[PDB]
Design a protein around this ligand. Structure first.
Ligand code: HEM
Length: 151
């Protein structure tokens, strides 16, 4: 698990995303889409955006980026006690949305990437560490609920 120093390190860095949730989420989602075009075809309200320009001008995209970073933030604030908040995300993405855990590993990396691009030289090596372990916590706990329902 994660220690309290690591969690505070995780929630410190989340102070950077909250200051611009629409900016960070937009860039996270665009980073997932162009690096992994197969993930875009899971979004049927973004399936059309064929270029990085359209995706950057699209505002339903910034909206959804806000709701993914809003909902992911609220889980990190649980500090591992996220079962109530993760459980319903685990099930919508397994049954209803049909989202490979691999794509949850894709966006995990995108989030780190987008932090470095947006905060180079003040996203420290311990803070990356911390943020990685909780994004890996987050995925492993989705994964358990994926296998439980055979996804
Ligand atoms: C990793 C962090 C993620 C978070 C916090 C998150 C959260 C959410 C939330 C809260 C919703 C709306 C409520 C719901 O339908 O359950 C949603 C919708 C959706 N998500 Fe995620 N999600 C994540 C990852 C992904 C990834 C990686 C994909 C695909 C590559 C994906 C695909 C979708 C789709 C297709 C929808 C429906 C969007 C719509 O048509 O409105 N999600 N997500």
């Amino acid at each position: 698990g994660l220690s309290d120093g690591e969690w505070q390190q995780v929630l410190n860095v989340w102070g950077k995303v909250e200051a611009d949730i629409a900016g960070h989420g937009q860039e996270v989602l665009i980073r997932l889409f162009t690096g992994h075009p197969e993930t875009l075809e899971k979004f049927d309200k973004f399936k059309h955006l064929k270029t990085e320009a359209e995706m950057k001008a699209s505002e339903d995209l910034k909206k959804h980026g806000t709701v993914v970073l809003t909902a992911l933030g609220g889980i990190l604030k649980k500090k591992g006690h996220h079962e109530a908040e993760l459980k319903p995300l685990a099930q919508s993405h397994a049954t209803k949305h049909k989202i490979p855990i691999k794509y949850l590993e894709f966006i995990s990396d995108a989030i780190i990437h987008v932090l470095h691009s947006k905060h180079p030289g003040d996203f420290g090596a311990d803070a990356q560490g911390a943020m990685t372990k909780a994004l890996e916590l987050f995925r492993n706990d989705i994964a358990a609920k994926y296998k439980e329902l055979g996804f």
